[PDB]
Design a protein around this nucleic acid. Structure first.
Lengths: 722, 493, 141, 548
RNA sequence: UGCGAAAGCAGUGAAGACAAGUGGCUUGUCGUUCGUUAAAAUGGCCUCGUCAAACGGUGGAGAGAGUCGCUAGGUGAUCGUCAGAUCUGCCUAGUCUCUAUACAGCGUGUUUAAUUGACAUGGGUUGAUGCGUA
């Protein structure tokens, strides 16, 4: 791996807290400084840098990088063949970009690539290039409607232009705009057939010799990705159903790959003889983020050779110009053919104008092997960050999460949402709570169901066996506002404590005589008020519980599971009403405990039954977090401190898109700010991994940490046996 | 890519008095044969060694039944009073029978014609006779003379020990299974006396005070014995000399006991007890002797046994009643040229360097509703749901998969009068049960929402809706009055 | 199986339950049947439990429970809760037997400390039979 | 970190015994014992002894006197045993043990040869240590530990003359430099305000704490890290903490130099020669439920004001999430001045209390979250307004809108204004169930009943409500039910609460039939209104016309 | 959209361009813009091995047949003024008796427990006009 932040050699290109739009846009395998000599790649970035990097051996002390001279464009992609090189660029009323092709040379002085400016197209709706980079088709949009044109970009062998009313059917010009909306296109290497996949779902292979079309109808929803094979006899196609189909274009026979756990937004054949297929899965279950799983697979048995995935969190709302992809309709997991500009404008105004800049997540650490579990929608991504690659993926609920590709009207469902999972402190059990949502338009559309599950596994394997599941924990139609594992004293850490929003508690623990995870204790007050500002703490003796309901931080025993009352009444304070709704009751050691509400942040000793220190939270968390997210905001240690974690929305000369993160650790009951650090991007989650460090998750999901004749003959023989 | 995950059956939360694995295993003892003997079946024992036969003592005849066909194979008729006890030796080679004249006749097993010897014991009826479990040449016979005896079967004229010291009607022997000097006898004055045989033998070494007159005493472990008499059995540690469990879960007196160990069962060891009231019950001596299953027969059950720990075949449970009859319940267990041509198909690669293995293990066969859902035939999934002999949780689970997965209206578009009647005909029964009533609710809700005009036109389902309304009225009456009982239980807090 | 293959959810043989099993924490009346019931509940006798409560004359039920001992009235409630949990068509003539023994032995089972725990089969039976009321209210509406 | 404090030789026995503990007594010949009685013969007494043990059978005890050795005494049959002398100064602190456990010739001067528990038993002489002023016996792997004001420290086991540790530990002549409750450490209780527990396996200090109060004589009990300490100039005996399965309540250890508190159990009644009263009745150190009782060793409370995330380039706040105000500056000197400003000449006015407190809390007078406050200060100023002066309009309306009132709420029934009591229901966030119940059952048939039912049903748990509304008369619930029948939802469920708390049997007939008639009509109309809420082709021959 | 609990409480436009129908008019649309916190083109998901027989755990409304045997009901035909008859009235539910737990589901690769056995996993010709047991 060649990390950007591991050297100043190209971290000077981007380190900025706001201006980080700079992106790598092409990778070539040769060398553009000198030809004919390859173990090293040349990366083209979207501004004009041409960085020659080495990946064989150790990374050098200086790259071979240049920066081409340009006009104000933005470097869409580069094209490479025998000798010649072209490059594509974008321009500037109707909002559509314009494309422009240049050619590159290098010979005279070794910093400058002379461009040559072949061709220009002044409005482009859509563009695609052949798999060898020998031709590119595009749309032009000159007026009554659009028009499609193919150009060849390394020689003047083919160019043609024609209106897509001559492509389109005559029966479709009385139909919806889904039946006329080209959402993907493709070309072959000879320029003889061009595939146009619309948004209604059908594909149309026009023959570029004379414009006669052949229709291929399989996709019941929109088409998102197409490619031709190298010989032009097979057509990869992919859309909203997570089925990579490949069309045998002689007799029109599909071969299906049906459950790809992500919708296909790009597919192309890769090898010389077409042995691998590279695909991109957009993973549309969480709409809070656009997270793409990259995947190649070999064509032989269609097994995923080398799938590639980052960490997959699910934020509270959408983040930064994150658009769910197009479809035939508008639903909760896509946006329609029209509503894309509407919802990017609405989400931009929700970022600028609105109040709830709340983009935090829940993440756990397995206390055995320290890998972190990102709860996805109805699933978990187990990901270990010592080598930053996903262990595996596991669906945990009984949804249609995998047994059906979801399309137009049935995209309007959503899976059970994994809202809580926590490990028991011995690492041998995983407690999980998720909310089954019902579908609409029937009698039971109003009542969610709540499911709590207890899973176990031995340490060798990578999936979790269910042991039992309680449905309707705490009664019917009530949530669990906070679950808590036990400290290692009450059942050798095989106990759990679940809190309602009616102030009720339940104690669930493992017994062996009845080999299951069952219910021991209960405390049920039925008020007629409800509030999701519930929090919990447990004393490491396994003795007293700290039930932080709204305004009511009660103290419960663990003998009889009721309110802490001593007959001598020696100021046995069993109640700390604070000023507002509390959201963190985090105990650090057995002595004291740090509480945080939406206004302030207190510390309270219990071998000295009163308050000790205070800090403000009102100018930082006013209402900018949901009532219940401060515990995944801030955390503690078992011994040596706690960590506040605040967020500043950086503003112009009205607040703007970008943020900065200010983290501050105090040690041992709020005494001294021994750590004050600022990172470039909004931060979502911090936690204590179990070797006295604290790890955090960014909003561009980067995990971070805060912590303490002979040799001549030999070389010639190894070069001849190479 | 992935394998398509199966359709999960709909398991609703569990209910009390469910099937424990122990009662599952015991409940599959079926096909209860009855045999009408002539008189009350006093005693029944099993062959030990190849334990495949059991000797049943009716009056004046001992019948060895076999455990492959459950009929009498051999019979012993030549007694002169009522025969009382019949037991096989530890090796199974010979059989002792105590008589009502005090004449312990030992035959050989599997030959009723050779009386091997005949002990003239005491003048009163000898009632319990059994060989040593560790030794093979001493025989314990206790009589209505309040004295048990250890005879040597070489010297059958005088007993090698004469265990006196009792006060009323000794009826039971046992031996302690590790220490072979220790004889635990039991009499009608409680008082499980037990004797070390190295000593004098006229005085027990200690006495275990059962209150009621004991009827049986067995030994479970080397260290704990179980004595039954009166309404209860009491278990006794011999070392600590101490009663440490008791069960009195019967109505009438416990007649007899026995015990199995390490046989093929979820229950590791089992103590079954027979108690004069129809009931024979099994207790699990690992989780503190709790009852786990029980049978009820048509009289006072006077003696019971089960086939021993190494039966290796047809596993039997027999109970002989005092009515004169007997009940048995069992659990049951091309050419050379062509082969030389097609030889190596049995190989599996012992000497082979690499071994590849990608043959997928063939799963369960998908049912009709599951494969219709997997092919997205939703109306056909409903048609396949409402076939006659279908399981009720299977109909429930396909209703749940149609409801959650897709859209009930989509599954319910092309219907009419004859193709809606199976749905509502199931909804009549399915609105009863609590596991199904909410799904039946929103299913019938959307079907009346889609088919309102057929309730005008077709009169074949008008009265179907009427009788559905009556069943909803019934179950909402029960679902309100149960809330009333919940309130008057909340008042009693 | 593949390494990019997501692990499918399967329940296996996991136990599913609810949040309501709290299983842990001179003659002049009638000639009734109450010695039948007491020596049925001392044992665990389904046959003559069924012959002592297929009878549904309400006053014989009443003075049967009155003549019944308080020490096995609670286990009578346990057997009754189990069987109306199993057979839902038995909730008619058998919640008579439960609305009497709550009434007749009033002090004993309000002195017993955990009625919810030792009768959580009855808690779960009534809570399940009565939590689905508003749905069939909407249905018959 | 104190414990439950009150009360102001075989050492593991109980009462019902003759004499299980013998000790030397002050201003007598030598010694005595106690009862709950046996003989106390001459075991070669009449010396300068002060300390006492026995040989752990109560049949062969020892009168450990200044003889340099000892004999076996006679208090079980009368028959003596044989003796021997090793050292020759004073055996006045002898600790005789069981069968070869820990016995050695430790007289007064660090000359302990190894030996065993018999008359002539002996072994190799381990007198090469320091003349330690703190030489004692412990039972972790049975040993003797010796720390010296010649400064030194050492540890040697009485099993194989097994010297395990030796260094220099400069402990001073403190009050009690005695081994801890589990004995792994040595708590050196310093004289005036201090006690340090030092790790007695490597001569290293583990916790040097201060003391809470005055204390002279302490004894570490059978606890985790706990001792009991009594004062010099007083009979005050408390317990402090820094057998573990069923705690040790009485007669586990004893050392006490208060006012004659000898043989100190919890019930330390049967003293040695005193025969006086007793004291505290606690157990040993429990797990974590003693923490709120023993909240001592620091009584230095003060007022914590609201601090901040401290200012270092804090002008770069970057769109602070507050409404319009940017920084609330805390003027606590001005708030302490507002206390003296409220203590001024507005005895029945509103110009020198009301607008003063509304100016030191600047808002729209019905809104919170403009907080710059302290609850002790607010309690004091609430008392300075409930003193010489509840007619105030601003301060006593804007701060019962405050979550920190601290039980100043008792006369909220005793004052009876319309609007002040309605606000006292719907805003005062501490208002107990006794006076809520009395205002619930002091009906004048008004809507304050409804608003007080909402508060009692949203604020308190049902068991705490029902055990308190046990404590009511019958005619208040009778006029309550007669109100509910004659002249509503929280009232319905509070009727359910009242009926559940009223008991089971002792009620009346026509009142119950009245509630029955009423409740059945309520059920029928609830059924029909829920029903309302849930309730919201071609022929072969026709004949029509066509236009002309 | 905002706020909140899972209930609910408040609040919902203008320009530009194009097409169609009748330079104008009228409507509809927008891979055009500003502001507000604001359904459809006959079109659906792969193979890699099936079958039979056991075994271990998990649930079960049990899967099904009887006995006019009890117990509670619900209801019908004809007659008969009703009383009451003939169908030895029918059905439901509970009970009583039974059986391979018959029922369903998950596994048995290594697991807390639990698996073995068949088969050339081809090609060819019929097999649908050759069937009555209604």
């Amino acid at each position: 791996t060649l990390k950007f932040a591991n050297n100043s050699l190209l971290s000077g290109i981007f380190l900025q807290e706001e201006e980080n739009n700079e992106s790598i846009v092409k990778i070539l395998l040769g060398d553009i400084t000198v030809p004919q000599q390859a173990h090293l790649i040349t990366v083209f970035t979207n501004n004009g840098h041409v960085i020659v990097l080495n990946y064989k051996g150790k990374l050098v002390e200086s790259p071979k990088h240049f920066k081409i001279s340009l006009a104000d464009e933005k470097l869409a992609n580069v094209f490479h063949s025998e000798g010649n090189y072209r490059i594509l660029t974008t321009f500037k009323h109707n909002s559509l970009q314009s494309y422009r092709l240049y050619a590159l040379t290098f010979d005279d002085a070794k910093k400058q690539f002379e461009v040559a400016h072949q061709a220009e197209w002044h409005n482009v709706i859509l563009s695609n290039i052949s798999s060898n980079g020998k031709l590119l088709a595009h749309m032009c949009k000159d007026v009554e409607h659009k028009s499609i044109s193919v150009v060849s970009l390394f020689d003047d062998s083919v160019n043609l232009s024609f209106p897509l009313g001559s492509i389109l059917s005559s029966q479709t010009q009385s139909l919806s705009y889904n039946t006329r909306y080209v959402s993907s296109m493709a070309i072959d290497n000879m320029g003889q057939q061009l595939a146009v996949g619309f948004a209604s779902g059908v594909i149309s292979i026009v023959s570029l010799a004379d414009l006669q079309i052949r229709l291929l109808k399989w996709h019941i929803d929109s088409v998102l990705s197409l490619s031709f094979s190298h010989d032009g006899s097979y057509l990869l196609s992919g859309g909203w159903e997570k089925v990579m189909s490949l069309w045998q274009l002689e007799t029109n026979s599909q071969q299906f790959l049906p459950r790809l756990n992500g919708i296909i937004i790009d597919c192309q054949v890769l090898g010389p003889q077409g042995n691998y297929y590279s695909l991109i899965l957009q993973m549309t279950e969480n709409n809070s983020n656009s997270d793409y799983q990259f995947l190649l697979l070999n064509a032989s048995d269609l097994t995923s050779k080398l799938s590639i995935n980052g960490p997959l969190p699910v934020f509270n709302s959408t983040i930064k110009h994150i658009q769910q992809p197009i479809s035939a309709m508008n639903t909760k997991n896509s946006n329609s053919i029209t509503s894309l500009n509407h919802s990017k404008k609405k989400q931009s105004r929700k970022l600028i104008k609105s109040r709830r800049q709340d983009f935090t997540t829940n993440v756990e650490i397995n206390p055995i092997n320290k890998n972190l579990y990102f709860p996805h929608i109805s699933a978990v991504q187990i990901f270990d960050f010592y080598k930053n690659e996903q262990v595996n993926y596991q669906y945990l609920t009984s949804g249609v999460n995998n047994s059906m590709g979801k399309v137009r009207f049935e995209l309007n469902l959503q899976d059970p949402i994994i809202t809580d999972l926590k490990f028991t402190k011995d690492g041998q059990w995983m407690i999980t709570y998720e909310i089954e949502y019902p579908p609409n338009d029937l009698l039971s559309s109003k009542d969610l169901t709540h499911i709590l599950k207890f899973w176990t596994k031995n340490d060798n394997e990578t999936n979790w066996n269910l042991k039992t599941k309680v449905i309707n924990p705490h009664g019917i139609s009530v949530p669990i506002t906070k679950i808590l594992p036990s400290p290692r004293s009450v059942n050798n850490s095989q106990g759990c404590l679940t809190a309602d929003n009616n102030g009720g508690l339940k104690f669930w623990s493992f017994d062996s005589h009845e080999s299951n995870w069952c219910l021991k204790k209960i405390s049920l007050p039925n008020f007629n008020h409800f509030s999701n500002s519930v929090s919990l703490a447990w004393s490491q003796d396994g003795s007293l519980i700290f039930h932080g309901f709204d305004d009511k931080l009660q103290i419960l025993d663990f003998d009889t599971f009721k309110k802490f009352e001593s007959l001598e009444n020696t100021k046995t304070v069993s109640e700390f009403t604070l000023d507002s709704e509390i959201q963190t009751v985090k105990l650090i050691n057995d002595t004291n405990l740090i509480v945080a509400t939406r206004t302030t942040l207190n510390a309270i000793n219990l071998l000295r039954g009163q308050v000790i220190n205070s800090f403000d939270l009102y100018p930082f968390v006013n209402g900018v977090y949901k009532n219940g997210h401060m515990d995944r905001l801030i955390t503690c240690d078992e011994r040596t401190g706690n960590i506040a974690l605040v967020i500043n929305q950086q503003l112009t000369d009205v607040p703007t898109i970008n943020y900065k993160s200010r983290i501050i650790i105090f040690d041992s009951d709020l005494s001294t700010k021994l750590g004050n650090f600022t990172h470039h991007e909004y931060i979502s989650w911090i936690g204590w991994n179990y070797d006295t460090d604290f790890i955090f998750l960014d909003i561009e999901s980067t995990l971070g940490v805060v912590g303490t004749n002979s040799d001549i003959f030999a070389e010639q023989l190894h070069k001849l046996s190479s | 890519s992935t394998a398509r995950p199966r359709i999960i059956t709909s398991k609703a939360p569990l209910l009390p008095q469910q099937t424990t694995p122990e009662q599952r295993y015991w409940r599959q003892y079926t096909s209860a044969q009855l045999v009408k003997e002539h008189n009350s079946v006093t005693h029944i024992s099993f062959n030990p060694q190849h334990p495949h036969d059991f000797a049943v003592t009716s009056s004046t005849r001992v019948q060895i039944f076999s455990s492959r066909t459950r009929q009498v194979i051999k019979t012993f008729s030549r007694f002169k009073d009522v025969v009382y006890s019949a037991s096989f030796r530890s090796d199974g080679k010979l059989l002792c029978a105590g008589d009502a004249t005090g004449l312990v006749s030992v035959y050989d097993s599997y030959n009723p014609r050779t009386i091997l010897l005949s002990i003239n014991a005491s003048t009163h009826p000898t009632h319990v006779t059994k060989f040593h479990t560790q030794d093979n040449k001493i025989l314990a016979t206790a009589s209505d003379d309040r004295v048990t005896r250890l005879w040597d079967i070489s010297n059958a004229y005088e007993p090698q020990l004469e265990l006196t010291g009792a006060t009323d009607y000794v009826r039971t022997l046992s031996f302690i299974p590790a220490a072979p000097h220790l004889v635990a006898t039991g009499s009608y004055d409680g008082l499980i006396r037990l004797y070390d045989t190295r000593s004098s033998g006229s005085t027990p070494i200690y006495s275990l005070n059962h209150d009621q007159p004991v009827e049986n005493v067995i030994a479970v472990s080397p260290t704990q014995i179980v004595s039954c008499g009166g309404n209860n059995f009491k278990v006794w540690d011999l070392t600590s000399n101490k009663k440490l469990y008791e069960r009195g879960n019967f109505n009438k007196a416990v007649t007899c006991l026995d015990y199995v160990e390490n046989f093929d069962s979820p229950m590791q060891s089992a103590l079954i007890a027979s108690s004069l009231d129809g009931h024979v019950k099994v207790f699990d001596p690992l989780d503190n002797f709790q009852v786990k299953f029980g049978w009820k027969f048509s009289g006072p059950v006077l003696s019971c046994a089960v086939s021993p720990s190494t039966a290796q075949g047809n596993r039997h449970l027999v109970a002989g009643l005092s009515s004169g009859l007997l009940a048995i319940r069992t659990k049951k267990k091309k050419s050379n040229n062509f082969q030389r041509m097609m030889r190596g198909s049995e190989y599996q690669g012992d000497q082979e360097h690499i071994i590849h293995n990608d043959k997928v293990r063939s799963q369960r066969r998908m049912r009709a509703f599951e494969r219709n859902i997997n092919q997205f035939k939703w109306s056909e999934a409903l048609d396949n749901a409402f076939v006659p002999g279908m399981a009720k949780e299977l109909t429930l689970t396909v209703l749940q998969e149609l409801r959650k997965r897709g859209k009930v209206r989509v599954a319910l578009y092309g219907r009419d009068e004859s193709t809606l009647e199976p749905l509502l005909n199931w909804c009549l029964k399915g609105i009863e049960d609590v596991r199904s009533a909410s799904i039946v609710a929103d299913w019938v809700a959307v079907v009346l929402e889609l088919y309102g005009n057929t309730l005008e036109s077709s009169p074949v389902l008008q009265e179907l809706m009427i009788d559905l309304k009556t069943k909803v009225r019934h179950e909402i009456h029960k679902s309100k009055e149960a809330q009333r009982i919940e309130g008057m239980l909340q008042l009693l807090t | 199986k593949d390494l990019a293959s997501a692990t499918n959810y399967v329940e296996g043989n996991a136990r599913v339950t609810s949040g309501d099993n709290f299983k842990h924490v001179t003659a002049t009346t009638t000639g009734t049947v109450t010695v039948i019931l007491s020596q049925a509940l001392q044992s665990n006798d389904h046959s003559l439990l069924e012959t002592v409560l297929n009878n549904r004359d309400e006053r014989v039920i009443r003075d049967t429970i009155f003549r019944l001992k308080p020490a096995l009235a609670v286990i009578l409630l346990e057997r009754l809760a189990e069987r109306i949990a199993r057979q839902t068509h038995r909730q008619g003539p058998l919640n008579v037997w439960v609305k009497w023994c709550l009434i007749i032995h009033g002090g004993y089972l309000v002195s017993i400390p955990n009625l919810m725990s030792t009768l959580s089969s009855l808690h779960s039976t009534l809570k399940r039979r009565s939590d689905l009321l508003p749905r069939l209210l909407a249905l018959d509406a | 970190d104190y414990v439950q404090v009150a009360d102001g030789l075989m050492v593991n026995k109980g009462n019902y015994t003759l004499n299980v503990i013998t000790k030397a007594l002050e201003d007598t010949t030598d010694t005595s014992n106690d009862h709950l009685d046996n003989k106390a013969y001459t075991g070669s007494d009449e010396f300068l002894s002060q300390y006492k043990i026995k040989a752990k059978a109560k049949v062969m005890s020892i009168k450990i006197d200044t003889k340099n050795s000892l004999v076996i005494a006679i208090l079980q049959n009368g028959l003596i045993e044989i003796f021997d002398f090793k050292l020759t100064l004073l055996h006045s602190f002898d600790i005789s043990y069981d069968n070869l456990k820990y016995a050695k010739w430790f007289t007064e001067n660090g000359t302990e040869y190894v030996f065993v528990l018999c008359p002539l038993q002996d072994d190799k002489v381990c007198y090469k240590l320091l003349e330690l002023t703190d030489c004692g016996s412990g039972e972790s792997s049975p040993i003797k530990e010796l720390s010296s004001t010649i400064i030194e420290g050492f540890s040697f086991e009485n099993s194989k003359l097994c010297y395990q540790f030796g260094k220099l530990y400069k402990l001073n002549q403190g009050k009690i430099y005695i081994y801890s409750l589990p004995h792994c450490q040595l708590q050196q209780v310093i004289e005036f305000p201090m006690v340090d527990k030092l790790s007695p396996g490597d001569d290293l200090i583990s916790f040097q704490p201060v003391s809470v109060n005055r204390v002279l004589l302490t004894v570490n009990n059978v606890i985790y890290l706990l001792d009991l300490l009594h004062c010099s100039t007083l009979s005050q005996r408390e317990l402090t903490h820094v057998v573990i399965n069923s705690e040790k309540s009485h007669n586990s250890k004893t050392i006490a130099i208060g006012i004659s508190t000898k043989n100190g159990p919890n019930p330390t009644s049967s003293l040695e020669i005193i025969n006086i009263d007793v004291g505290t009745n606690t157990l040993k150190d429990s797990l974590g439920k003693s923490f709120q009782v023993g909240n001592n060793d620091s009584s230095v409370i003060l007022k914590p004001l609201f601090d901040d995330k401290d200012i270092n380039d804090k002008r770069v706040k970057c769109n602070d999430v507050s409404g319009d105000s940017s920084v609330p500056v805390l003027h606590c000197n001005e708030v302490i001045e507002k206390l003296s400003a409220l203590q001024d000449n507005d005895i029945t006015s509103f110009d020198d209390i009301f607008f003063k407190e509304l100016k030191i809390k600047e808002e729209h007078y019905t809104e919170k979250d403009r907080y710059i406050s302290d609850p002790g200060f607010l309690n004091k100023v609430l008392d300075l307004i409930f003193g010489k002066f509840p007619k105030t309009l601003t301060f006593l309306l804007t701060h019962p809108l405050f979550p920190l009132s601290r039980t100043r709420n008792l006369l909220s029934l005793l004052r009876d204004q319309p609007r002040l009591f309605k606000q006292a229901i719907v805003t005062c966030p501490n208002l107990p169930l006794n006076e809520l119940l009395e205002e619930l059952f002091s009906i004048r048939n008004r809507e304050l009943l409804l608003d007080i039912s909402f508060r009692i049903l949203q604020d308190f748990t049902r068991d705490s409500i029902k055990q308190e509304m046990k404590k009511l008369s019958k005619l208040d619930v009778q006029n309550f039910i007669e109100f509910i029948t004659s002249g509503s939802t929280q009232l319905f469920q509070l009727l359910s609460l009242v009926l559940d708390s009223i008991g089971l049997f002792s009620l009346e007939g026509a009142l119950l039939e009245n509630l029955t008639l009423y409740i059945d009509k309520q059920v029928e109309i609830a059924e029909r209104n829920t029903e309302l809420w849930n309730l919201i082709a071609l022929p072969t021959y026709t004949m029509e016309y066509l236009d002309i």
